[model samples]
Target chain A: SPGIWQLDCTHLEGKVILVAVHVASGYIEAEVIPAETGQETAYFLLKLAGRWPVKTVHTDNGSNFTGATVRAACDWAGIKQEDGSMNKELKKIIGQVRDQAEHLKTAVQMAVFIHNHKRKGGIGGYSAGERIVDIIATDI
Target chain B: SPGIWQLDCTHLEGKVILVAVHVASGYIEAEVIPAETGQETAYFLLKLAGRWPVKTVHTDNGSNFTGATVRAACDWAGIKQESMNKELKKIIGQVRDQAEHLKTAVQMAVFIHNHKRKGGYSAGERIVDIIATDI
Candidate 1:
């Protein structure tokens, strides 16, 4: 169940969103963190691994990802770490959330849902969610 | 013809777009420039004046607006230059065209911004209404 992942970050209204993309299936997972700290990133990676097995993490050489806490988390979880790409379209969708919601984190959650469920090109027109799970059968 | 203007720039696929916002009416104008040169900016200001009255131009102290060409154009056009704004930023990315038709992209962005229904009259309609009252 090991999978390769691409990781990146985007900012909005002084908040940081960590984005992780499953390379093989184009499935995406995003988490909103209070700050871009190694502890925060380390926690996010651990949680991500709970949902899907993370074999290798590819990210830019940002200290947030290369820091001691993140390295330790990966090592402890038997997750290999490696380096930069972005989901610009995903970031753009998140930016378009017009309402200044009192719960910024909840807004990001909805934005990620919109991106993951969209029928996109370069992935056979199937949604990211469809690639990861059976939308029809799972619902039943 | 006095109005408050806010000027800013946005980048896309290695191109620069200069955006001007009429603060009072929320009207927007955009230009795709080869570069952020004062010469190019000066020409945009002149053309903008032809379309709308030039009262004052506000922008950041970016060299593109501070250089001699822009300064000369503003002074000549009776435009008191001042500085700083971003709706066009989101619109450009959302309603983008091929790089070959960048100007068309800008035109479409402005059109959508001005015509978006706010309450009753859209921004474009409101601008027309205010101008009619002024007349």
Candidate 2:
């Protein structure tokens, strides 16, 4: 964790798949779209997804995430639209999805599934999703 | 030149205006919108402006233009998002970099964009002169 949340993009055909990793919970979210839609759009679409509230985010030297839109959105809450690298779990899942005959969007859903359900070793061996739920339950 | 053309986005006072610049005739068409509605809106807003046909367009890496909606629209004709290539983009970039009264500055630039000549301040030839009647 870089002390904040993170996000990244990858290509599948002409589609751009986005992945965001929550630093606090280690939970992951994914989406497949047409192209580099910019960080502002990325932030709202993700941060607003569930109970997850975004105050800041970070990414690499990528394009959309580097936009002022990301900065402006964060101002109301505060965070980086920083580019991020995919972890091994994400890399493996995304790579595996590539092997399937599924559409990009469908492929992302499975990747999300694998990331949450399969990747274990959390507190008492709970999955990351379960661990994150436990974290939220504890009010952290 | 392709019957289709390129479209670009400009913000003025929080208004996102979409423009169509013809490849051969130098014809320019425009529209204004509120909120950050993406490319689907952009395509429809500009297409009905006149009888002109679209071939292909280029635009910046903005979310709207890069969305699936853009790809579908391209299948119908064509488009260029007019991303920041750092040409007259300098003018747009400088004003945006200011980041204070962004909308106002963008509108001002667009005011010139509409009336400026062929080469614009570069050479000077009113766009209207080279523009055709959408036919």
Candidate 3:
């Protein structure tokens, strides 16, 4: 399974940073930083690997993600950094999901439910959740 | 007595011109033109002078009055030609005079009639007649 990560910033009184990654099928790992820093980012990566089998970790060139700590975490986990190439594909997929949600007149939660459980993927013509469950069952 | 000549266009459909001069005190000696020419104007001037002492003759700036004939006639008569300055002055003067006279006469008549009639005086010493006559 391909790992995808998204980095975003939020400002409430002051700026805070967040990095979210799809570490495994149907699993998301996210870290919230008081102030965006590379050391804090490495801590998040180490924490994420403890709970998930991270084969690949994708990130943008934010100071937090490119820091030595984050780099060390990735090296230790044997996670290859797959970034840049997936940006266009990820945007296209997000766009389709957003369009379906808007067309179905559903809230964000309901849309996510439909995306994981109802929508059939091209790879095996099964819902994302179903495909993940099947792969997990076989691999484990 | 000084004489005033009042001349006006007659709106006649011919080449004839009409002019009249009368005493300022009273309407008197005047000249009339049936057909206007230099000889005709000269003849009228002579006739006008025969009737009374001519001081000034007033006429409009029509071709007939400004012509050589009229000019020669005026010279012969020793009459100075004074052109009427504005067209409506004469008519307006007559209408205004008539209106004022009529207004006074009507008020006087109404006063007299109202006084003699019953219930004529509302109060005081029958002031209706006096007030109306004054107005």
Candidate 4:
């Protein structure tokens, strides 16, 4: 919740997919956007904030992430936006779509679901979703 | 007319902007596609063939350009698709509620590219001449 989150943007099927990963919990959130604009990124951050306590949004030096609007959004949300990927696996899942153009948004939604639910040995044998639950419990 | 044409794809504003330049005429055609699949590329080629004399569609070895669908389209159009492959590049290299209307912006950009003076004539001029001949 209150940890550094890595952000990345990948273009697919004439759309841009923006993903955010909580480094500690491996909890992921994403959305499909039409353009990779700073405004869109800022809006996405606000949405993320609504759900989780985002301390910092670590992203690469893409203009979309580093622009003034994003910085302002960070200021408003009481967080920092820093220039970052754990998206390789998510990309592999997205690349599997062949003819399902209309369902890209759902495809990404499913990929994010699979990622958050995947069990990993390093994270105390708990899936990312489970790790998030653990963090919530301990923090409380 | 009967010359190599360069094909390139540039992504902008959530849409794939596919551009084709007639090597000799500098005449260009472009469209905004939702996906860069073989199917979309094939459809574009057919659309290009309808308007101009595309002897060959010279393009980079992108999956969208090299797929079986594109080759089949070329075969059907009785044109050869070649790989060899820019002001056309620069024009596309350059909105919001304007977001949904991104395609219209692309159309405007393509119009600008075609209307600009390349050498002794503009791409638009050449196209108009061909159209005039058609009539």
lDDT of 3 by residue, A8-113 (tens): 4433224343434343444222223557787656655544443334566656666677666667656855567766422233333444554433322122222233
lDDT of 3 by residue, B1-135 (tens): 344465554432232334352423222222224565555555555444433345687766666676765675567456787732122233323333432333222222222222232444311112212222222
Model 3: CA > 4 A from native: A2-17, A23-27, A85-133, B1-135
For candidate 4, write residues B18-54 as lDDT tens digits: 8787676566667678898988787677656633445
Compose the digit string of candidate 1's lDDT tens values, residues A24-135: 6676777678899987787667656533446788887687976887787678556786644447776666567536324566456546656665776865576665554332
Candidate 2 local lDDT, B33-75, one digit each (tens) = 4555555454343333212234455555566655665564444
Per-model TM values vs. the true structure = 0.45, 0.42, 0.31, 0.47
After superposition, candidate 2 runs with Cα above 4 Å error: A1-3, A43-50, A77-88, A95-101, B1-135
Model 1 regions lying over 4 Å from their true place = A83-86, A121-124, A134-140, B1-135
Q: State each model's CA lDDT, in order.
A: 0.64, 0.48, 0.42, 0.65
Positional deviation of A42 in candidate 4, in angstroms? 0.6
Clashing pairs in 1: A58-A83, A59-A83, B59-B83
lDDT of 3 at A1: 64
- Ordered from best to worst lDDT, the candidate numbers read 4, 1, 2, 3
Across all candidates, the chain A TM-score values are 0.81, 0.70, 0.53, 0.84
Write the candidate numbers in order of decreasing TM-score: 4, 1, 2, 3
Q: Residue A8 error for model 2, in Å? A: 1.8
Categorize the docking of model 1: incorrect
